[PDB]
Amino acid sequence: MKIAIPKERRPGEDRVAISPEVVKKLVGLGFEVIVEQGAGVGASITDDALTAAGATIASTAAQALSQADVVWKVQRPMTAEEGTDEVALIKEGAVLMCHLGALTNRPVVEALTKRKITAYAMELMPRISRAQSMDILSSQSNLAGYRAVIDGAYEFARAFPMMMTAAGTVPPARVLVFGVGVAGLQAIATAKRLGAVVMATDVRAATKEQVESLGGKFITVDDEAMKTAETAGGYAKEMGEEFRKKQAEAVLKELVKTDIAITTALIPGKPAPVLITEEMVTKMKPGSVIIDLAVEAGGNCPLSEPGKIVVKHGVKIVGHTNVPSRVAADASPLFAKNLLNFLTPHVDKDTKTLVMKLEDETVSGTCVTRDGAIVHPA
Amino acid sequence: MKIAIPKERRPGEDRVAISPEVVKKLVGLGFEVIVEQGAGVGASITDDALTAAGATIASTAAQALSQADVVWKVQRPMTAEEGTDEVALIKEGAVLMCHLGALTNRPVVEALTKRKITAYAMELMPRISRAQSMDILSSQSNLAGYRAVIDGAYEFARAFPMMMTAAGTVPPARVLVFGVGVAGLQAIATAKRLGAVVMATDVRAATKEQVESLGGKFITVDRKKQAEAVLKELVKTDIAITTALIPGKPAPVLITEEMVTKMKPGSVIIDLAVEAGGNCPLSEPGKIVVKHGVKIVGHTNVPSRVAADASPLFAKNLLNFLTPHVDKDKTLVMKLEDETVSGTCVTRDGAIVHPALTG
Amino acid sequence: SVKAGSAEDAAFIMKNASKVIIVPGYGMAVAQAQHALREMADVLKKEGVEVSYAIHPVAGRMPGHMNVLLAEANVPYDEVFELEEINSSFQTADVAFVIGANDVTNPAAKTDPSSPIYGMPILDVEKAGTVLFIKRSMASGYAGVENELFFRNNTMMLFGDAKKMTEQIVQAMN
Numbered sequence: 085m086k087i088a089i090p091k092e093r094r095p096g097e098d099r100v101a102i103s104p105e106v107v108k109k110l111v112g113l114g115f116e117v118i119v120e121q122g123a124g125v126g127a128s129i130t131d132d133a134l135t136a137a138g139a140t141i142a143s144t145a146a147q148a149l150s151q152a153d154v155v156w157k158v159q160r161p162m163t164a165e166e167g168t169d170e171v172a173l174i175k176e177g178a179v180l181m182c183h184l185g186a187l188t189n190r191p192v193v194e195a196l197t198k199r200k201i202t203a204y205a206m207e208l209m210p211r212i213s214r215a216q217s218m219d220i221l222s223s224q225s226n227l228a229g230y231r232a233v234i235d236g237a238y239e240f241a242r243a244f245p246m247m248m249t250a251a252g253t254v255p256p257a258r259v260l261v262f263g264v265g266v267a268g269l270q271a272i273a274t275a276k277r278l279g280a281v282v283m284a285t286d287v288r289a290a291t292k293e294q295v296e297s298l299g300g301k302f303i304t305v306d307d308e309a310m311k312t313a314e315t316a317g318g319y320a321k322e323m324g325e326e327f328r329k330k331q332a333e334a335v336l337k338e339l340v341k342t343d344i345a346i347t348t349a350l351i352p353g354k355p356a357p358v359l360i361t362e363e364m365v366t367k368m369k370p371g372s373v374i375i376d377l378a379v380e381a382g383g384n385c386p387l388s389e390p391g392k393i394v395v396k397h398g399v400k401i402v403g404h405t406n407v408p409s410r411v412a413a414d415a416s417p418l419f420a421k422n423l424l425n426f427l428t429p430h431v432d433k434d435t436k437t438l439v440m441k442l443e444d445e446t447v448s449g450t451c452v453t454r455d456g457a458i459v460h461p462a
Numbered sequence: 463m464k465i466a467i468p469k470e471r472r473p474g475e476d477r478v479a480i481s482p483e484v485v486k487k488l489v490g491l492g493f494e495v496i497v498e499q500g501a502g503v504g505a506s507i508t509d510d511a512l513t514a515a516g517a518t519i520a521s522t523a524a525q526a527l528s529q530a531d532v533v534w535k536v537q538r539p540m541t542a543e544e545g546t547d548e549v550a551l552i553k554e555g556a557v558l559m560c561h562l563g564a565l566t567n568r569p570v571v572e573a574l575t576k577r578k579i580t581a582y583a584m585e586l587m588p589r590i591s592r593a594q595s596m597d598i599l600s601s602q603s604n605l606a607g608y609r610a611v612i613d614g615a616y617e618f619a620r621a622f623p624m625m626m627t628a629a630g631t632v633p634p635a636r637v638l639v640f641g642v643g644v645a646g647l648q649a650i651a652t653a654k655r656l657g658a659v660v661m662a663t664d665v666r667a668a669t670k671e672q673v674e675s676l677g678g679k680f681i682t683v684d685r686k687k688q689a690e691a692v693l694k695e696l697v698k699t700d701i702a703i704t705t706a707l708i709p710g711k712p713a714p715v716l717i718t719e720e721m722v723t724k725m726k727p728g729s730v731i732i733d734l735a736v737e738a739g740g741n742c743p744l745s746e747p748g749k750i751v752v753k754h755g756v757k758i759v760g761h762t763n764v765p766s767r768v769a770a771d772a773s774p775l776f777a778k779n780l781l782n783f784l785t786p787h788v789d790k791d792k793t794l795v796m797k798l799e800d801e802t803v804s805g806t807c808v809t810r811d812g813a814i815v816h817p818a819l820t821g
Numbered sequence: 822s823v824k825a826g827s828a829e830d831a832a833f834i835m836k837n838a839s840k841v842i843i844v845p846g847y848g849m850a851v852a853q854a855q856h857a858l859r860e861m862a863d864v865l866k867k868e869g870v871e872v873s874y875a876i877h878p879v880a881g882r883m884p885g886h887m888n889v890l891l892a893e894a895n896v897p898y899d900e901v902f903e904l905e906e907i908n909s910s911f912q913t914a915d916v917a918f919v920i921g922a923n924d925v926t927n928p929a930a931k932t933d934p935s936s937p938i939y940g941m942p943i944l945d946v947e948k949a950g951t952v953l954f955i956k957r958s959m960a961s962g963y964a965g966v967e968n969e970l971f972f973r974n975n976t977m978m979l980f981g982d983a984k985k986m987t988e989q990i991v992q993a994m995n
């Protein structure tokens with residue numbers, strides 16, 4: 085029972101799925117912990133720090149995975165047609181834990197299934213309170229929320245905080261956060277830290293109080309629909325074209341005076357809802373900045389383009405990809421601990437085995453393939 | 463009288479020496495206010511915003527400056543020697559107010575003198591209480607200090623604040639500010655409000671209390687080997703911001719290459735003194751360079767990175783300087799007894815007049 | 822030759838008043854007295870009293886010095902006013918709570934032509950019915966000149982650290 089963690093070969097992907105803290109814990113469970121050379125450079129994790137914590141170091145990707153009974157990655161492994169065939173480097177019959185993508189990534193799933201590899205998809209983690217320590221959406225989107233404000237302030241040609249000065253008063257920047265989940269709450273907090281006046285909106289009723297606790301002001305649209313907007317899962321549903329219009333009119337009174345708009349709204353299995361149309365952008369002040377964190381799921385603004393900064397109507401619409409990788413040295417230790425917390429409960433220890441419960445909904449709401457069978461309710 | 467504000471022509475200058483508020487004040491003093499079209503674009507001040515305030519829009523620079531009795535700009539006018547003769551666009555006998563950099567740029571002072579232009583170098587504003595409102599050094603430096611932190615946070619791959627989560631805790635960033643003038647103080651404030659642990663050092667005694675008045679910690683030795691205490695913190699630092707500057711002299715070296723080799727990889731240095739040589743010799747103007755695992759950031763013209771807030775403040779400095787001298791009866795008389803006028807006048811009516819430049 | 826005064830009994834003066842203007846300065850920043858200041862303010866609003874903060878353009882030692890510290894203590898923006906929008910309101914206020922400020926209030930800027938602070942517009946705190954200066958001692962400010970306001974009929978000094986004095990006043994407000 086030995087575990088190995090490779091470096092990320094994907095363009096821009098700087099997060100590693102390991103840390104000194106975690107390898108120390110894996111050793112305790114009964115793991116020989118090999119790690120690919122220089123795998124934590126983008127995360128500012130050195131090889132020497134891995135060793136001291138209790139990790140052997142492989143000099144390549146094929147050498148790390150060769151005899152590894154378990155493999156931890158961040159993003160899905162690349163397939164033959166993507167370039168290098170990482171799936172084949174993995175010893176057959178091993179277990180693989182990462183953001184395998186799944187649902188929207190079928191090539192990778194059948195290839196890992198061809199080599200008996202039992203893989204677990206962390207994005208599908210149940211929305212129950214006890215799984216928050218194993219939950220990669222929350223750990224990563226929290227940091228993306230912070231990073232949105234940092235990217236907004238970087239692109240903006242003004243200062244955030246009010247400053248009374250001998251040359252006159254620098255006014256505070258006004259920020260509007262669209263969607264107040266994990267990312268939106270951190271964007272409010274980080275914008276308020278920097279001295280901005282912060283406005284917020286969401287379709288779920290319970291958001292109102294969360295915004296006020298952070299000192300933001302909430303834009304009630306209600307439509308009576310905010311009571312029945314949140315689901316049993318805690319995620320939003322499609323609200324409708326009529327509400328969208330009721331929302332757009334209410335939003336516009338603040339949006340005209342808004343300097344930074346941060347949009348974070350997501351709907352599971354569906355395109356991202358449109359919150360700021362090109363018409364609404366035309367009413368905005370020149371020098372304004374939109375940060376679209378939902379860009380890889382369609383976008384909350386249709387003018388956003390993934391991996392680019394778009395300028396139209398004197399407004400910068402920013403749509404970076406993989407925002408959590410822009411905070412890679414914080415993201416990675418947290419990702420590796422999500423995985424550790426998911427895995428630890430199902431280790432025998434005495435005979436050094438790994439019996440993944442099966443009955444535990446954490447386990448079954450995650451296992452995409454097992455010993456050559458895809459086994460999932462797609 | 464006519465007063466004119468052109469667009470800034472130097473590479474990377476997005477500021478402008480005007481705002482809508484200041485336009486309507488100049489009109490109230492009996493000025494016709496003309497600005498070159500597109501002049502406020504980088505500062506988010508549209509031609510229409512300007513025209514609503516009471517100004518006229520000129521189509522070119524030459525036309526804006528053609529009949530102007532007073533000219534305002536931010537950076538010194540370019541000379542023929544630099545391939546663009548902006549001095550020749552200014553009317554003979556006119557008044558120019560800007561950041562001249564006159565003590566280190568005698569060529570422009572000589573070119574203004576030849577046209578009988580009276581030039582007021584705003585960077586030479588005297589350090590008296592009543593001129594703090596006319597002081598472009600502090601209004602621009604302050605915003606540069608703020609920016610330094612924003613730029614540091616952008617280039618860093620960890621978050622500034624401590625965050626305690628279900629998946630574990632991420633520590634705060636550690637910031638070390640070298641030099642605690644206006645820029646340094648706003649850097650400490652901006653880093654602190656973002657959640658970083660901030661250490662600062664300065665040679666000057668009175669700075670220690672200023673640092674603490676913002677919640678920073680001063681590097682102390684509780685003699686000439688005070689670098690041990692500095693290095694002890696620098697080795698723990700994620701972001702080093704250096705702001706130490708000396709007029710008409712190269713910037714002091716505060717972080718040696720030997721010191722950067724002792725820093726952790728992933729660290730960033732923001733060198734605000736890069737245009738005067740740098741407080742770090744590894745910095746290069748207009749570039750982010752990586753050596754020994756550390757990014758050394760040396761952007762030029764940091765106030766122009768905040769051009770939309772910098773420009774209103776700069777135009778107000780200019781207005782505050784001019785206003786006491788517009789006693790209409792509708793003319794401009796700059797009274798020689800005024801220290802603000804004598805401290806700042808570089809050349810007048812065809813002769814160099816500032817005592818630092820007559821030889 | 823100057824009039825003194827202590828922590829005691831400044832709490833009801835403000836509790837009884839209809840209107841109070843807080844005037845923070847450098848000393849407030851040195852003591853980090855701002856969290857205590859904000860709690861002193863909203864106990865007043867809970868009483869129905871109207872509270873305000875008057876910010877001089879050059880309070881503290883940097884631009885926006887008071888703003889960052891007040892923001893850290895969560896003072897609302899709608900209660901913070903610049904010198905030009907607040908100066909006339911001192912006429913109508915019962916109390917001027919000056920905490921760690923000095924040069925910023927000094928009348929020799931309008932009078933005394935041959936002074937180092939001359940020509941710098943100041944906050945007209947004297948025009949308030951009563952003026953309380955919190956500072957540790959009678960010592961001068963950045964200008965290094967005396968302030969006439971410390972010794973007249975409408976002024977009372979509070980001689981203590983700005984953090985300590987204000988904390989104490991909050992306890993007397995309960």
Ligand SMILES: NC(=O)c1ccc[n+]([C@@H]2O[C@H](COP(=O)([O-])OP(=O)(O)OC[C@H]3O[C@@H](n4cnc5c(N)ncnc54)[C@H](OP(=O)(O)O)[C@@H]3O)[C@@H](O)[C@H]2O)c1
Binds near residue numbers: 962963
């Ligand atoms: N803001 C800027 O950009 C800037 C820059 C440079 C200079 N300045 C100058 O600084 C001055 C600022 O005016 P200001 O009224 O804010 O400050 P100030 O006039 O210099 O006075 C500060 C006062 O606070 C008191 N103090 C110090 N520590 C204290 C403590 N811990 N507890 C209670 N009080 C304490 C001091 O009295 P005690 O000794 O009795 O404690 C001192 O008299 C102006 O002259 C301005 O021109 C401003």
Ligand SMILES: NC(=O)c1ccc[n+]([C@@H]2O[C@H](COP(=O)([O-])OP(=O)(O)OC[C@H]3O[C@@H](n4cnc5c(N)ncnc54)[C@H](O)[C@@H]3O)[C@@H](O)[C@H]2O)c1
Binds near residue numbers: 263265287317357
């Ligand atoms: N393990 C768990 O118990 C678990 C895990 C993750 C999240 N959650 C919870 O789920 C909730 C949502 O978190 P999230 O970050 O995953 O959300 P998300 O990423 O799915 O979406 C972000 C926000 O956008 C909002 N939104 C969607 N459409 C909108 C529109 N039409 N207009 C305005 N806002 C719109 C949503 O309501 C949501 O708050 C939170 O309360 C969170 O705590 C629970």
